[PDB]
Paper text:
TnpA binds specifically to the transposon ends and is a member of the SR family of DNA exchange enzymes, which are most often associated with site-specific recombination reactions. Although there is considerable structural similarity between the catalytic core domains of the subunits, the quaternary structures of the TnpA and smSRs dimers are radically different.
Although the overall configurations of the TnpAIS1535 and TnpAISC1926 dimers are similar, there are significant differences in the details of the dimer interfaces within the core. The active site serines of each TnpA dimer (TnpAIS1535 residue 59 and TnpAISC1926 residue 74) are separated by 28.6 and 31.5 Å (Cα atoms), respectively. The E helices are interrupted by a four residue β-turn (GRRG in TnpAIS1535 and GMRS in TnpAISC1926) and fold into an antiparallel structure. Proteolysis experiments and structure modeling suggests that winged-helix DNA binding domains are linked to the N-terminal end of the catalytic domain by peptide chains ranging in length from just three residues to about 10 residues (IS1535). Thus, the two DBDs can readily fit into adjacent major groove segments on the same helical face even with the short three residue linker that is present in TnpAISC1926. The best diffracting crystals of TnpAISC1926 CTD were obtained using the hanging drop method by mixing equal volumes of a 10 mg/ml protein solution in 20 mM MOPS, pH 7.0, 100 mM Na-acetate, 0.1 mM DTT with a reservoir solution containing 8% (v/v) tacsimate, pH 4.0, and 20% (w/v) PEG3350. Crystals grew at 25°C, and although additional cryoprotectants were screened, they show no increase in diffraction relative to the drop solution alone.
Author numbering:
A (entry chain B): 65 to 164, 168 to 211
B (entry chain A): 65 to 211
């Protein structure tokens, strides 16, 4: 069962934790009996739909080369719209195997802000005073 | 040539604005000369990936019946992950035609409603789906929005 490993970390500092993720899935697959075709990684947010590695994964899947995609948690593949990726892959007959995070809270808070900042711009103005009010307030509120 | 109309409104009260949507696109199409194969609608949030209409649209496109999808704004198809839907459709050789751009004007009420749900879900993920600190952040953000 030809497999493609997708691993992702948000920050550059977390570079060591990404290699551990690849390694978990690499040994996971070779114990399961999967031949690891390729290993695709990214040091970016789950929110970015234009990740270089993710778009290489899309092309790999579409090329009907691989049979299964391995990720540690759903969170790794994408923050939002997993179901759409699941649908794109399934039409190519590719299954997503989710091996399991209670760990990441800093990733959830950081992703929350970036959403609030973009939406605040859409609601009040990308260079408005009220946008700054909400984002400075929310940042202070999480501190508590 | 063969076209499918996708229209969406978040609330039941906005039922009049959904029919206006369908109409803009139905005529747009007859002017484009496109034959409108089907019209799919939904009274739900862009955040819901499991909309009955969206999933009927997915099956229609996958069946290679339709050639183009018409929407007024990207926003209508989905709040997040438009690029994934765009990719799913393109592999079936279906194009998404977005009639409008940076035109949203009333959209501020849908953006704030979606923003509250996002903060509520994330608060659960950060503090606990039934936690005290989750209630603290969501009650605070709601109060901060008023101002």
């Amino acid at each position: 069962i030809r497999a493609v490993i997708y691993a992702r970390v948000s920050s550059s500092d977390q570079k060591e934790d990404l290699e551990r993720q690849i390694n978990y899935l690499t040994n996971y697959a070779t114990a399961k009996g999967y031949k690891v075709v390729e290993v695709l990684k990214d040091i970016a947010s789950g929110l970015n739909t234009q990740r270089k590695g993710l778009l290489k994964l899309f092309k790999l899947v579409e090329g009907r080369s691989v049979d299964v995609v391995l990720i540690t948690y759903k969170d790794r593949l994408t923050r939002f719209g997993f179901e759409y990726i699941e649908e794109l892959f399934s039409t190519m007959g590719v299954k997503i195997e989710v091996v399991f995070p209670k760990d990441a809270t800093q990733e959830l808070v950081e992703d929350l802000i970036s959403i609030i900042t973009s939406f605040a711009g859409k609601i009040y103005g990308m260079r408005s005073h009220k946008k700054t009010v909400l984002v400075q307030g929310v940042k202070k509120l999480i501190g508590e």
